[PDB]
Symmetry: C4
Subunit: 385 residues, 4 copies
């Protein structure tokens, strides 16, 4: 079965909780990896949590977070959804300090980038076998989504960036077939900035909503078809999606400069001219999380919206978030089901531990009754080491 990716997003009214791994609470006693970016992705049969570890465990000296983000120890691993990430239940995927993965209906594509800042190489694997490599073309931290790539009709698609994180960089869409890059195109996107894209399939095409780290407090997006014919823009809503950001106000269909530098990985789902935005509750801190339905927020610049669903209270830490979908081949539905995950970051810099790790929660969009609450990390810091 190759996933067709021809269905449109399911009608939904809210988000039902799908998983919670309690990774950090468990790792207080058990043998649990220090991780970041616990992104979920699914096949036609099952869903997995992928994550990066520095190959060190919680409550151990090697968790010391003074290690560079881009270290030769960092690996992409995966485990079943909702389980603490341990060396006893986790599969090895790739050596990587930046990553993506996705399933085409027949096999897993994993992308793991390692190597030096001035010449990083993405290693592509299909079913665990190396199938291609892509080397840095600007010699400045080649990097990718940190969430699932999107697959449509036997090809999978991702976005890579190379260049400054605080100025204009270079952005490419990649089309990958059975692990081999068969087409790419560079975005002609002066004055845009794309990092950490959350990309999903929709009606035979792909939509990516990303992080502008340079000068936008709204999120950039890029959409494209199977030929890589693309469109670009920013989400117009004055309900700003990045962190940090200003208070809600008048939005822009280009980058909103106020509080624009820096950011956080996030996602949104487009429905017609409306948008579901996932975002932190705080405008300044990685605290809280909420889903907002703004029925004209993709294309209109007002700050009005119609629904807010609480996910994590502003008094609790949140973190990266990303989209994942469940295809009809998996669910039996006739539409593409949107879901998202949230990383709940504990430790440095906000808290007095030697380490930084995340646990995770995830939700799927449903057209049935839901409720807002807070499902935070719950660990009591610090630990013993």
């Amino acid at each position: 079965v190759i996933l067709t990716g021809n269905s449109s997003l399911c009608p939904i009214s809210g988000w039902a909780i799908y998983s919670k791994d309690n990774g950090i609470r468990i790792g207080s006693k058990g043998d649990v990896f220090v991780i970041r970016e616990p992104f979920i992705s699914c096949s036609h049969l099952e869903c997995r949590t992928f994550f990066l570890t520095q190959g060190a465990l919680l409550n151990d000296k090697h968790s010391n977070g003074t290690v560079k983000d881009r270290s030769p120890y960092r690996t992409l691993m995966s485990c079943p959804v909702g389980e603490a990430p341990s060396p006893y239940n986790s599969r090895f995927e790739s050596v990587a300090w930046s990553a993506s993965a996705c399933h085409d209906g027949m096999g897993w594509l994993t992308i793991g980038i390692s190597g030096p800042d001035n010449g990083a190489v993405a290693v592509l694997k299909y079913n665990g076998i190396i199938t291609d490599t892509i080397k840095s073309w600007r010699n400045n931290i080649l990097r990718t989504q940190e969430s699932e790539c999107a697959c449509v009709n036997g090809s999978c698609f991702t976005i890579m960036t190379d260049g400054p994180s605080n100025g204009q960089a270079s952005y490419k869409i990649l089309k990958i077939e059975k692990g081999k890059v068969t087409k790419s195109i560079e975005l002609n996107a002066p004055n845009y900035h794309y990092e950490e894209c959350s990309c999903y399939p929709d009606t035979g095409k792909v939509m990516c909503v990303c992080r502008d780290n340079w000068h936008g407090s709204n999120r950039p997006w890029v959409s494209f078809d199977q030929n890589l014919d693309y469109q670009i823009g920013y989400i117009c809503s004055g309900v700003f999606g990045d962190n940090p950001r200003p208070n809600d106000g008048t939005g822009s269909c280009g980058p909103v400069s106020s509080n624009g530098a820096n950011g956080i990985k996030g996602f949104s789902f487009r429905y017609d001219n409306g948008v579901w935005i996932g975002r932190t509750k705080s405008t300044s801190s990685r605290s809280g999380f909420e889903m907002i339905w703004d029925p004209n927020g993709w294309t209109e610049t007002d700050s009005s919206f119609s629904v807010r669903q609480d996910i994590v209270a502003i008094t609790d830490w949140s973190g990266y978030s990303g989209s994942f979908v469940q295809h009809p081949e998996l669910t039996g539905l006739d539409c593409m089901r949107p879901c998202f995950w949230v990383e709940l970051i504990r430790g440095q810099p906000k808290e007095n531990t030697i380490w930084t790790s995340g646990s995770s929660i995830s939700f799927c969009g449903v057209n049935s009754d839901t409720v807002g609450w807070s499902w935070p990390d719950g660990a009591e810091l610090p630990f013993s080491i």
Copy 2:
């Protein structure tokens, strides 16, 4: 295979021991979850122990019981029968502080309720994919069986309660097909109280034996067909089934008010006008466990009975108990085999630890020789943390 559920309960003379997990003894050293309600449910292929954890391990500070029962950390997980519940051998099922699960012959249905007390939502999954949600209709702690739902002819059935635990509440039967609620009905049950139902299939219908927490020291029951045409009553026997309860005496076919407030999850099996009652040995404490065959105990109020089989000595702690069955599709038999599990609760409030957990034992009904004994938890408390 869909399980037909048309067979009648097997003839039995007693109970043979099926499993014992020694979870707490093992958790003295190993990495074992703090758990409650270790209920068993089976498919046509295998049996699993489902349970709720606070996402915390024994011998760790996060096991501190002062965590509310209905926390955002609580999850429904499952592991193979008879194994200590560890993060290294347990599958994640649902985020949940009250739960049920059962298999229809084709896939697992799990029901996990989380959210706030005033608006809890049951997330239903079939084969791990969200298929439906049910929101609180009385805004007062929507809650369910804490043991296996019952499946007959491709539909599965459960009971949910919403409302006070110390007065009249609202009780609904749900009919669920491939994880979708296809029918429900509210019980017209003034003066009844239903919590924590133990429900099993028998001859194409379902029988549930429950807990009256309001004003009954005998157990309420509800039985229904596939259309949800129901009957209700209380077990008539003067061999009282709840805990606490009075000394055995004259029963009632309605709620027995003496020592009626409070209670414990339990079960019973009806055979004609007779009943197999599982109950604690103490009338005041959650201590001991025994099976009693009262050949007229379903419909008659005398305190006479004919067989007692010891399961746990009165000098050892017991706890919740529930029914599970093994269908002909699993066993090759021509009848529905009754089994039960018992939770052996250690820690608070009866013991001086920061935590409360249970281990489990289980037994199956056989028409061959058996013996009474005591198979208690066996852990020596307190632990280190």
Copy 3:
């Protein structure tokens, strides 16, 4: 595939090492069960180590060996051959303080005996489902092989004893089909004593070599066909097989009274009128292990033998041992392959620890070059707890 069991034992010249689990060395740090009787048994696809645990781990207070042997905590579990027995890699089989198991080509038969000394019940399971029970018929510690039962042509066979361990008892052969006892017969064996039988299939029949705990320092045997037509005797060799025993000398075809009380589980393989005897090296202590080929030792009473192969040095602890076979269905050979396991007992009474546990080694008989050595337990006692 049902195993035919019609082949005769393979011609062999010696024993090649098959496994070593290093369980106790590993359990110095890892989470490893305290176990006894690590017996191996195989299907047509794989081999497993079965074992009894008190549901406690090494380096923990619950390993305190003052617990009765026959406790309600004892369980029969299994794990893959050669792996340390941990709660993370072990399957639960049965609640049991005496056990046997074997595979008929279609499913696993497990037999676990629990309950009180005066009324123990063996629970039989086939594919994990209870299929029969057998209750004590002399009310005096019903007990069985502690090694694999033997299967021939769709039936499996075992020996149970009930009665004194220091005088005449009662011995029965059981024939079991898909987990159900279909025939049994009591041995007419005045002045014999049978415990802890090691039974293997050979040419459509079964041979058991056992432990006389009453008054024999040679080993009793019983052989029988599928109808339970049986023969009994003792191994005639003056190379005495039990522990304790006298120095080698003139044997007897009945029980050898010198040093006859007490014993150890062991095994031997009959070839024509000759015998391979596995035995401790010490006549008085459970120390060392060796395989002896005595070409007339089944029926002749001299103390001459022709081959000795060292297995464990006399300076290292040994313990229980038993036979297992690999059938043609597994191996592809045209003969029945004999193997054996040895339990290497550490701790009490010989050593200053609170616990007693065994690790294991195993060997298979080959007709190719082999070597004698010592493969002892290797743990450094005591541990920390």
Copy 4:
């Protein structure tokens, strides 16, 4: 599927990183074996890391290295590629202090040598069942590759050595079919020394590149067809491959005596008259690792080469290395893909711990962009015990 082994080595330009297990970093906290020789071998379906352990974990007294290398505790185990080797994720293979393994397309062959120095025996298993044994013919430490054997057209091939490690010894090629030795031949190799061969299939034949521990600082090789018709030589390049070795200079097609005694397990791949050499960066210490393409280095003695790719910095410890391939049956390619693993040795004798262990990295040859870097072990020594 039997692997044909008829394809030729893939064209490559460099090495892409395939795995890194961080075993020692993880073992600082988790339950991880002390291991050596973590060699990779693949089937038509998956790849595994095989290794030898002393049956002891990191951070435990049993890791005390003073245990002889050739102990009765040493076992060959395997785990998935890239996972820390733990008792909870590792399969038992053989009792062994020297080993090989490889898959023929239908099943795993493992070879494990144990026993005394004067009479060691190789136990061969196919699909885990003993199929043959080979006893020492010179009575002086029978020993084998410590990396994967090579399979071609349903036969698998290995090299064993028996005799001195510091003078002339005896070297045999074995041809093994379904775990049975069907042919062997002794190398007529006066003045050669072969240990620890790294052997791979190429165009229906096998090439082995080995370690001369007697008097060669270049590497000996032996190649042979399916009939065991062989050729022998040494790698001619003045880019010397062993450790220790002299500075690069004029090579020889026979053993280079300068710094020739001692050595390290390593590998090289022949392409026409050229060679990819993997070697330590230091000439005196087991430090660093690099791949060197010398386009005439198989047959010509100059010290010129054309490509160097860094793998481990000279400031970090390396260790043994070996070849493994991925056959077309696994990859879908039309050529035989070369890969290699490196063992990163920590502890004694270079570091102040009681133990010695390695972690691993591995790379596969690709004809696409790659990059040099350093991917060292990363553990901070000493540990607690």
